[PDB]
Amino acid sequence: IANQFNSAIGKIQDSLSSTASALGKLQDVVNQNAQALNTLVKQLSSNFGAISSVLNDILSRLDKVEAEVQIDRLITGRLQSLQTYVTQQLIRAAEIRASANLAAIKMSECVLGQSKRVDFCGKGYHLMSFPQSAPHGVVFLHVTYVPAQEKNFTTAPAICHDGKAHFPREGVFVSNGTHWFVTQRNFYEPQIITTDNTFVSGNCDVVIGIVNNTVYDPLQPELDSFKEELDKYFKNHTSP
Amino acid sequence: VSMTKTSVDCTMYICGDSTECSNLLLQYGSFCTQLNRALTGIAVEQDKNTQEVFAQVKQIYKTPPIKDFGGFNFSQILPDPSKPSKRSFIEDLLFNKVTDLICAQKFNGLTVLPPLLTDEMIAQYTSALLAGTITSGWTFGAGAALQIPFAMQMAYRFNGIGVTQNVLYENQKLIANQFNSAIGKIQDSLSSTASALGKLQDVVNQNAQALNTLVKQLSSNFGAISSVLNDILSRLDKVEAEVQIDRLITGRLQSLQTYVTQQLIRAAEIRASANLAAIKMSECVLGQSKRVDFCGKGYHLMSFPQSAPHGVVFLHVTYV
Amino acid sequence: TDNTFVSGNCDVVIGIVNNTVYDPLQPELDSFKEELDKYFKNHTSP
Amino acid sequence: SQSIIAYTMSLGAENSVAYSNNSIAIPTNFTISVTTEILP
Ligand SMILES: *[C@@H]1O[C@H](CO)[C@@H](O[C@@H]2O[C@H](CO)[C@@H](O[C@H]3O[C@H](CO)[C@@H](O)[C@H](O)[C@@H]3O)[C@H](O)[C@H]2NC(C)=O)[C@H](O)[C@H]1NC(C)=O
Ligand SMILES: *[C@@H]1O[C@H](CO)[C@@H](O[C@@H]2O[C@H](CO)[C@@H](O[C@H]3O[C@H](CO)[C@@H](O)[C@H](O)[C@@H]3O)[C@H](O)[C@H]2NC(C)=O)[C@H](O)[C@H]1NC(C)=O
Ligand SMILES: *[C@@H]1O[C@H](CO)[C@@H](O[C@@H]2O[C@H](CO)[C@@H](O[C@H]3O[C@H](CO)[C@@H](O)[C@H](O)[C@@H]3O)[C@H](O)[C@H]2NC(C)=O)[C@H](O)[C@H]1NC(C)=O
Ligand SMILES: *[C@@H]1O[C@H](CO[C@@H]2O[C@@H](C)[C@@H](O)[C@@H](O)[C@@H]2O)[C@@H](O[C@@H]2O[C@H](CO)[C@@H](O)[C@H](O)[C@H]2NC(C)=O)[C@H](O)[C@H]1NC(C)=O
Ligand SMILES: *[C@@H]1O[C@H](CO)[C@@H](O[C@@H]2O[C@H](CO)[C@@H](O)[C@H](O)[C@H]2NC(C)=O)[C@H](O)[C@H]1NC(C)=O
Ligand SMILES: *[C@@H]1O[C@H](CO)[C@@H](O[C@@H]2O[C@H](CO)[C@@H](O)[C@H](O)[C@H]2NC(C)=O)[C@H](O)[C@H]1NC(C)=O
Ligand SMILES: *[C@@H]1O[C@H](CO)[C@@H](O[C@@H]2O[C@H](CO)[C@@H](O)[C@H](O)[C@H]2NC(C)=O)[C@H](O)[C@H]1NC(C)=O
Ligand SMILES: *[C@@H]1O[C@H](CO)[C@@H](O)[C@H](O)[C@H]1NC(C)=O
Ligand SMILES: *[C@@H]1O[C@H](CO)[C@@H](O)[C@H](O)[C@H]1NC(C)=O
Ligand SMILES: *[C@@H]1O[C@H](CO)[C@@H](O)[C@H](O)[C@H]1NC(C)=O
Ligand SMILES: *[C@@H]1O[C@H](CO)[C@@H](O)[C@H](O)[C@H]1NC(C)=O
């Protein structure tokens, strides 16, 4: 388990070393803030119909009545440029808030604890995650237990022994072909079916697909060996 | 989950067939490109939102031909090979109920691109998700799919709500009969009314209305002598025409900035809905919610996705 | 034995320690042995 | 001999599941896997 984890962290350094696209979202946000700034700058150059883009030149050619017309184009167009960029930015910001609020919830549920939500803390059953800082962002190193070598087995919902019906307390009942066992639902480790592994309800008539086997009782040979202890004190007590 | 991929030629929507208007529009410049970048942003986003909700598994699971699912009769929500498009039964009810203006927009340099995923591809991901859920329980989400007998899955679910697995098996008939009875009402409901789908219809009707309203702003004078560009250009020369055109460019450009601002904002609503739906898939469909009411009222057992026009339906199953 | 469960042998668990583990069934039977032995002994008597 | 092609996207590999009314699969082994997830 430790070796697989060490092997996986190795692959993270390798992955981040190998591809350009990994930090995609963060590199995207930076590109969008810079592109929007340069777009805002570039509207300063636009004439809007005024005889120049350069505000002093206009003063140098027109009086207070005609400069007011030409300048009011640049003010109206420019003010429309700031009202545009700030709208795009208030919207952009609203995307980032939803991202941040998820990232806060993931910090709480994937770092300060272990989530049961499926695929919420990366693909596979969650074990833990390690947070890492980035330019304007966070990276989570999610650690999961992914099933890897499955094998086919026969199963039955329940077992009949004393003509009562029996169920796993936790786990499932499975046959290797020749013998029935009980095991945990998420890793193969078969066990002898016993009273302690199981619980009982009703007779064998209602449960569809129920099968017949023994149930072993760990009290029983502890009393059988105590019956054979008892008989040996009787045979000895026949001797005197 | 998504909406129409609008695309507009801003030059088309401001300056349709005028070079005079084109030269005047260059006095403003990048506003035309900038809006197209914004609409292109939302248009590419639809393929993300639709991948995020449906493409949660990268392998195409399929049903066995035999249907020994303990009496649970999914045939109403699984695909139908007899159909010209392979959706289920319940998905045709969804497609039949949600609804010249579309040509009038087309003449004005407005366009609607098709989504990357065809509605059959959406039915195909849905088929894999649903068949996976039945044949394999949650296990196909967390790793390679492990088969399980359907009543053994249902026992796990019952234990997931702390109800004991014998309480399933001791009533398996009543449970399957109620599951079948409930899907019978899902059909009867979705066949009868259309009001339950009103969330999707209201999303279409807003997007369609915003395109109608943006179209209807072309027929506006804005205080120029005509609402029609050409009727100015026909009547006035290069001194006078420009002043009446510069008003229509201004009024129209303001009318576009407005529609795009509305649509970026609207698209933030749909993205919240996409993220919620992706989570609802990831937790109710690929899992079992311990979250209360998050997968419908009652204790969560399991949920089945069904495709819908630009959206998704979850059929949540609950113990009550 | 009821608070715990059992798997494997002493080699595999890094840092496993030694102690008794109680069995509640043990003195519950052993007192039944003292009860039994008192019957055995009395049956020597007659 | 490389060229730009066009195709309907195959959504993945096809896989009919080994379902039966009495069949289960169980992992005898597992991978501990680590992923990155990146957030603004
Ligand atoms: C299914 O699992 C069964 C339990 O692991 C297994 O049965 C066991 O088979 C071994 C031999 O492979 C037997 O080993 C014993 O054989 C005799 C018993 O008198 C002794 O000489 C040996 O020392 C050893 O104790 C087990 O007795 C037997 N267990 C049981 C409960 O019968 C099956 O072989 C497995 N089936 C398949 C298809 O592999
Ligand atoms: C699983 O094991 C059960 C115990 O062996 C077995 O039950 C037994 O089945 C037979 C046939 O149904 C019964 O046979 C008797 O039936 C009546 C009396 O009730 C007589 O008319 C017959 O001549 C015959 O004697 C056994 O009495 C019955 N015993 C019990 C406790 O069930 C199941 O049939 C087995 N099932 C499978 C699938 O193997
Ligand atoms: C926990 O209890 C274990 C069982 O008593 C105990 O294992 C025993 O430890 C001693 C000392 O390490 C070993 O002593 C013998 O070691 C070799 C033969 O194996 C000889 O060269 C020595 O002379 C000596 O006889 C026992 O063999 C060993 N028994 C077993 C079954 O492994 C652990 O040491 C105890 N651990 C703690 C921390 O209490
Ligand atoms: C899991 O089982 C399926 C089929 O179920 C078993 O198949 C028989 C061979 C036998 O074991 C029966 O008791 C079961 O019903 C396997 O599917 C087979 O796969 C091979 C290719 O590997 C193919 O040639 C066969 O036609 C398939 N048969 C069926 C019925 O699908 C599957 O491979 C098994 N998986 C593992 C990991 O063992
Ligand atoms: C599952 O439910 C469907 C719907 O009732 C059943 O299919 C119908 O079966 C009857 C009897 O053969 C026919 O009259 C209908 O035309 C069928 N409809 C469809 C859509 O196929 C199906 O038989 C049920 N399966 C089980 C195992 O009960
Ligand atoms: C639990 O409630 C169910 C109904 O939800 C009962 O099932 C019905 O029982 C009557 C007879 O009492 C039958 O006529 C119906 O046809 C049954 N319906 C179904 C769908 O099976 C059930 O009897 C109740 N059980 C208990 C123990 O109260
Ligand atoms: C479980 O899987 C791991 C690999 O993921 C197995 O470990 C390998 O075991 C073989 C020998 O069988 C060695 O050659 C490899 O070098 C091992 N790799 C590691 C990381 O140790 C492990 O043995 C498997 N367990 C079982 C029960 O099969
Ligand atoms: C399982 O399927 C077989 C056919 O392959 C059928 O004959 C049998 O009765 C079924 N058993 C159960 C418990 O469903
Ligand atoms: C038999 O019982 C006597 C006491 O009555 C005792 O001394 C002796 O050790 C016992 N022998 C065996 C083999 O149990
Ligand atoms: C615990 O740490 C000490 C060193 O401080 C070491 O000697 C001991 O063997 C360690 N035991 C385990 C189980 O790691
Ligand atoms: C013998 O044992 C019985 C109890 O079973 C007791 O009542 C009786 O007093 C005993 N007699 C002697 C002589 O020990």
Residue numbers in the entry:
A (entry chain B): 923 to 1162
B (entry chain C): 729 to 827, 848 to 1068
C (entry chain A): 1117 to 1162
D (entry chain B): 689 to 728
Kindly provide excerpts from the paper associated with this entry.
SARS-CoV-2 is an enveloped, positive-stranded RNA virus that enters a host cell by fusing its lipid bilayer with the target cell membrane. The fusion reaction is facilitated by the virus-encoded trimeric spike (S) protein after it binds to the host angiotensin converting enzyme 2 (ACE2). S1 contains four domains: NTD (N-terminal domain), RBD (receptor-binding domain), and two CTDs (C-terminal domains), protecting the central helical bundle structure of the prefusion S2. The RBD can adopt either a ‘down’ conformation for a receptor-inaccessible state, or an ‘up’ conformation for a receptor-accessible state; movement of the RBD allows the virus to protect the critical receptor-binding site from host immune responses.
Another VOC, Gamma (lineage B.1.1.28 or P.1), has spread in Brazil and some other countries. There were two classes for the Gamma trimer, representing two one-RBD-up conformations. All mutations except for R190S are located near the N-terminal segment and contribute to reconfiguration of its extended structure. The three RBD mutations (K417T, E484K, and N501Y) in Gamma also produce no major structural rearrangements. K417T and E484K are probably responsible for loss of binding and neutralization of Gamma by antibodies that target the RBD-2 epitopes. The Gamma variant lost binding to the two RBD-2 antibodies (G32B6 and C12A2) and to one NTD-1 antibody (C83B6), but retained binding to the NTD-1 antibody C12C9 with somewhat reduced affinity, suggesting that these two NTD-1 antibodies target overlapping but distinct epitopes. ACE2 did not dissociate more rapidly from the Delta RBD than it did from the Gamma and Kappa RBDs; one possible explanation for the apparently weaker affinity of the Delta trimer for the ACE2 dimer than other variants is that ACE2 binding induces S1 dissociation.
